[PDB]
C-alpha cells in the first residue's frame, strides 16, 4: 500500500485562483486525517454532516479536493447558506454539503514583499452561479444601455481583479489556503478510506 499523496495537495509551492479553482480527484488511496488534527497549524477545521472522530471510520467513493486561495475573513462564506461576492460569482457551496472545509494560514509562503498579484477573482456578473460550476471569461460588462463595443468607457468595466497579498497584511486579508474536501457517496466502490 502506497502513501496517499497529500503533499501535492497540502504543501505545494504555488496554488490556483478562486475563479479558476483547481479540482483534484483523489481515489483508491489511504488518506490519513489523523495527522491533520495534530498538525497544530490548521486555523479552521469544520465538517458539516461528518465528524473528525467519524472521519477515520467512514470510507468514501471519491474525494474531490478543490484547492484555492482567499482572504482570511472569507472562509465563513465557504458554507451552505451564505451570501457575498464569492458565494455567488466564484465558488458556491450547496445547502446539502456533506464534507469538510480545511483552511490554514500561509502568510510567510504565498506572500512576497512588494505584493503578489498572481491570484484573481471576479467582481461583476449579470447573474448568480448555480452550485458547482466555474466560468472563465474576459468579456466587457455593460452597466447601462448605451451600449459599448469592447471599449472600457462610460459605465463599462473589466470584471477580473487581483489580490494584493503581502507579508504584513492583517489577519482578515492574509492568504488562507483552502481545501474543500467534498465527501460524497456514489454508485461506485469505495476505497478512499483511512
Amino acid at each position: 500500500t502506497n502513501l496517499c499523496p497529500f503533499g501535492e495537495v497540502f504543501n505545494a509551492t504555488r496554488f490556483a485562483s478562486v475563479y479558476a479553482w483547481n479540482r483534484k480527484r483523489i481515489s483508491n488511496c489511504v488518506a490519513d486525517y489523523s495527522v491533520l488534527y495534530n498538525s497544530a497549524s490548521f486555523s479552521t477545521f469544520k465538517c458539516y454532516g461528518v465528524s473528525p472522530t467519524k472521519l477515520n471510520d467512514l470510507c468514501f467513493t471519491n474525494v474531490y479536493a478543490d484547492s484555492f486561495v482567499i482572504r482570511g475573513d472569507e472562509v465563513r462564506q465557504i458554507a451552505p447558506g451564505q451570501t457575498g461576492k464569492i458565494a455567488d460569482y466564484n465558488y458556491k457551496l450547496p445547502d446539502d454539503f456533506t464534507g469538510c472545509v480545511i483552511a490554514w494560514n500561509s502568510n510567510n509562503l504565498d506572500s512576497k514583499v512588494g505584493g503578489n498579484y498572481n491570484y484573481r477573482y471576479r467582481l461583476f456578473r449579470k447573474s448568480n452561479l448555480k452550485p458547482f460550476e466555474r466560468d472563465i471569461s474576459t468579456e466587457i460588462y455593460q452597466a447601462g444601455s448605451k451600449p459599448c463595443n469592447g471599449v472600457e468607457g462610460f459605465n463599462c468595466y473589466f470584471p477580473l481583479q487581483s489580490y494584493g497579498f503581502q507579508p504584513t497584511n492583517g489577519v482578515g486579508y492574509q492568504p488562507y489556503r483552502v481545501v474543500v474536501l467534498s465527501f460524497e457517496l456514489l454508485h461506485a466502490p469505495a476505497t478512499v478510506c483511512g
Partner: protein, 597 residues
C-alpha cells in the same frame, strides 16, 4: 437599470481599486517617516500624484449623476463625498496662479527668519529656538521684540498675497453654488435629509453665540483672578482695571495659558502630583507601558490587540544615524494594519499619550467594518474627544494607587484638588474666546462686511472688547497679523478646537453618571465597569453613516450642545474663585491701552 444602480456599480469599482493604491502610498510614507533621506523624497510625490490622478478622473466622472434621484441615505452620503469639485472649476491660468500663491506663502512661512541685526547674539532658530524664547521668559522688552519682529517681516510679505488669495477663493466658492469661502468652511456641520435632527449653516453662529454668553461669567472670574495674580510679576506695565497685553500670554499668539501655571499656583508649598520621578526609578520602558495600558481597556470590556501590532510598531528613537519627525499622530495603514510610532521620553507626559494613542487605535478598529468612504468620525471634532477622556479616567488617584504610579497612601486634601483643577482650567478655559474671535473675524472679512480700510482696525476692536486683550503697538493697514498663524498661512479651519472641548465634558458626565458614582465629577473612574464601555461602543461603531446630532443623542440624551456639565465640573473651583474675588474688581474697560500716553 436606474440611477441608483449605476451609482452603486460605480462605487463598487471605485472601492475595489482605491485600497490597493492608498496602501502602497501609506507604506511608502511609512518607510520614509522611518528614514529621512533624499533617496526616497520623491516617492511621496509619486504616490501622491498617482492617487491624485486616480481621484481626479473619478471625481470628474462622478458628476453625470444627480443627487435628486437617490432615496438611499447610505448611497447619498457616499456620492455627495465624491462630487466635491473643489478648485477644478477655475481656469487653467487661474489655477496655476492659485497654486503659485499657495506654495509661496508656505515657503515664506517655513523659511522665515527673525533676528536683531545690531546684536549678533540675538539670533536663534524656531524649534527649539524662537519657540522657547516665548515659553520660559519673564522679560518684557525681550518678549516684545520677538513678538513684533515676527509679524513685521513674515506678515508684511503675506498681505498682497492674502488679498489675491481672498479674491481667488471667493471666485472659487461662488462657482460651486456657494456664497463665500466662509459658507464653504461652514458646510461640514450642515445636516439635511432627516426629520427631527436637521441643522443649518446659519444656526451655528446662533448656537456658538448662545454658549459664549453662558460661559462668560466663569471666564470673567478666572480672568480677574489671573490678572490679579499677574500684577506681582509686571506691576509697572498693567492697569488694575483695563486689559491684558497680548505679548505676555505664555506663547507667541495666546492660544493656551498653560505656561502661566508656574506663576499662578494657589498652594505653592503642597507637593504637586508627580510621576516622572517614579517612572525613572520603576524600570519603565515602552514595552511595559503598553503591556499595562492594554489591561485598562480590557477591564471595561474592550477587545485585545493583534500580533503584528507588537512586531511592526517603532517605539524608541533610532539614534542619530537617521532623522525622523514624530509630530503627534497614530497610524492606520489600511487592509487591517494598525501600528504606532511615538516619541518616547521619560516624563509625566508620556503615560497619558500612550493611553491616548491606544484610544485612537481603538476607535479606528471599532468602525473597520464600514465601507471605504464612510470610515471616519461623525464630524471633525469627534475623533479627538474620545481619546481625551481615556487620559482623564486613568490619572485619578483611585486608579494610580492600584497600578502604583502614586504612593499607596498619597493623601487627598483640598489643597491638592484645587491645584489639579486650576491646572486643568488654565489649558481649557483660556482658549475658547480666542477661537471664537478668530473665526468671527474670518467670517466677517470673507462676507465683505469689513472694507479694506478696516481690516486692521476691526481686528483689534473685537480683540479688545470680547477677550480683554490689547496691543502693545499700533498697527496700520499694511500689516497682516492673522496671517502670522500656521493655520491661516496654510489655510486650515479652526472651529473644531472649539466644539470638541464642549463635547468631551458632556461625554464624561454621562459616563460617570451611568457608572453609579457618588461624589464630585472630577473624582470619577469608569474602570472595572463594563456598562460604560458598552455604552461608548455603540456610538463608536457608527462612523460617518449617521448625523452628529443623532450620534450625540444616542449617548447623552440631548441633541444639542451644552455648557452645564462643564460648569458642574468646575463648580468646586468656581466657589473658591468667587470667595477669593470679594475685594477685587471684576470686569474690564475697553478705553485703555499701554501706548496711549
Amino acid at each position: 437599470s436606474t440611477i441608483e444602480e449605476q451609482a452603486k456599480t460605480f462605487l463598487d469599482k471605485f472601492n475595489h481599486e482605491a485600497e490597493d493604491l492608498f496602501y502602497q502610498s501609506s507604506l511608502a510614507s511609512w518607510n520614509y517617516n522611518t528614514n529621512i533621506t533624499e533617496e526616497n523624497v520623491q516617492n511621496m510625490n509619486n504616490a501622491g500624484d498617482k492617487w491624485s490622478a486616480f481621484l481626479k478622473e473619478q471625481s470628474t466622472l462622478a458628476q453625470m449623476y444627480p443627487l435628486q434621484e437617490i432615496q438611499n441615505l447610505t448611497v447619498k452620503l457616499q456620492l455627495q463625498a465624491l462630487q466635491q469639485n473643489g478648485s477644478s472649476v477655475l481656469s487653467e491660468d487661474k489655477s496655476k496662479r492659485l497654486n503659485t500663491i499657495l506654495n509661496t506663502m508656505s515657503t515664506i512661512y517655513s523659511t522665515g527668519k527673525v533676528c536683531n541685526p545690531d546684536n549678533p547674539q540675538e539670533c536663534l532658530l524656531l524649534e527649539p529656538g524662537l519657540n522657547e524664547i516665548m515659553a520660559n521668559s519673564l522679560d518684557y522688552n525681550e518678549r516684545l521684540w520677538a513678538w513684533e519682529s515676527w509679524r513685521s517681516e513674515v506678515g508684511k510679505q503675506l498681505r498682497p498675497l492674502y488679498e489675491e488669495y481672498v479674491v481667488l477663493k471667493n471666485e472659487m466658492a461662488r462657482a460651486n453654488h456657494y456664497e463665500d469661502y466662509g459658507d464653504y468652511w461652514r458646510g461640514d456641520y450642515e445636516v439635511n435629509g432627516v426629520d427631527g435632527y436637521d441643522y443649518s449653516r446659519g444656526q451655528l453662529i446662533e448656537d456658538v453665540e448662545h454658549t459664549f454668553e453662558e460661559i462668560k461669567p466663569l471666564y470673567e472670574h478666572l480672568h480677574a483672578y489671573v490678572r490679579a495674580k499677574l500684577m506681582n510679576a509686571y506691576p509697572s506695565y498693567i492697569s488694575p482695571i483695563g486689559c491684558l497685553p497680548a505679548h505676555l500670554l505664555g506663547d507667541m499668539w495666546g492660544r493656551f495659558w498653560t505656561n502661566l501655571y508656574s506663576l499662578t499656583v494657589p498652594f505653592g508649598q503642597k507637593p504637586n502630583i508627580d510621576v516622572t520621578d517614579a517612572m525613572v526609578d520603576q524600570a519603565w520602558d515602552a514595552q511595559r507601558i503598553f503591556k499595562e495600558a492594554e489591561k485598562f481597556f480590557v477591564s471595561v470590556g474592550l477587545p485585545n490587540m493583534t500580533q503584528g501590532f507588537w512586531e511592526n510598531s517603532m517605539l524608541t528613537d533610532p539614534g542619530n544615524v537617521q532623522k525622523a519627525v514624530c509630530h503627534p499622530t497614530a497610524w492606520d495603514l489600511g487592509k487591517g494594519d494598525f501600528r504606532i510610532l511615538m516619541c518616547t521620553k521619560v516624563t509625566m507626559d508620556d503615560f497619558l499619550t500612550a493611553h491616548h494613542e491606544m484610544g485612537h487605535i481603538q476607535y479606528d478598529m471599532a468602525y473597520a467594518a464600514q465601507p471605504f468612504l464612510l470610515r471616519n468620525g461623525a464630524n471633525e471634532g469627534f475623533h479627538e474627544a474620545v481619546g481625551e477622556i481615556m487620559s482623564l479616567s486613568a490619572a485619578t488617584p483611585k486608579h494610580l494607587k492600584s497600578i502604583g504610579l502614586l504612593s499607596p497612601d498619597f493623601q487627598e486634601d483640598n489643597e491638592t484638588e484645587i491645584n489639579f483643577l486650576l491646572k486643568q482650567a488654565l489649558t481649557i478655559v483660556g482658549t475658547l474666546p480666542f477661537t471664537y474671535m478668530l473665526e468671527k473675524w474670518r467670517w466677517m472679512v470673507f462676507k465683505g462686511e469689513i472694507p479694506k480700510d478696516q481690516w486692521m482696525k476691526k481686528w483689534w476692536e473685537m480683540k479688545r472688547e470680547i477677550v480683554g486683550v490689547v496691543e502693545p503697538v499700533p498697527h496700520d493697514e499694511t500689516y497682516c497679523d492673522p496671517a502670522s498663524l500656521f493655520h491661516v498661512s496654510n489655510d486650515y479651519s479652526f472651529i473644531r478646537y472649539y466644539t470638541r472641548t464642549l463635547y468631551q465634558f458632556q461625554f464624561q458626565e454621562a459616563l460617570c453618571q451611568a457608572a453609579k458614582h457618588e461624589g464630585p465629577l472630577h473624582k470619577c473612574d469608569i474602570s472595572n465597569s463594563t456598562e460604560a464601555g458598552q455604552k461608548l461602543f455603540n456610538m463608536l461603531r457608527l462612523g460617518k453613516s449617521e448625523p452628529w446630532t443623532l450620534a450625540l443623542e444616542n449617548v447623552v440624551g440631548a441633541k444639542n450642545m451644552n455648557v452645564r456639565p462643564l460648569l458642574n465640573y468646575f463648580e468646586p473651583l468656581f466657589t473658591w474663585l468667587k470667595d477669593q474675588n470679594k475685594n477685587s474688581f471684576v470686569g474690564w474697560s475697553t478705553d485703555w491701552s499701554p501706548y496711549a500716553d
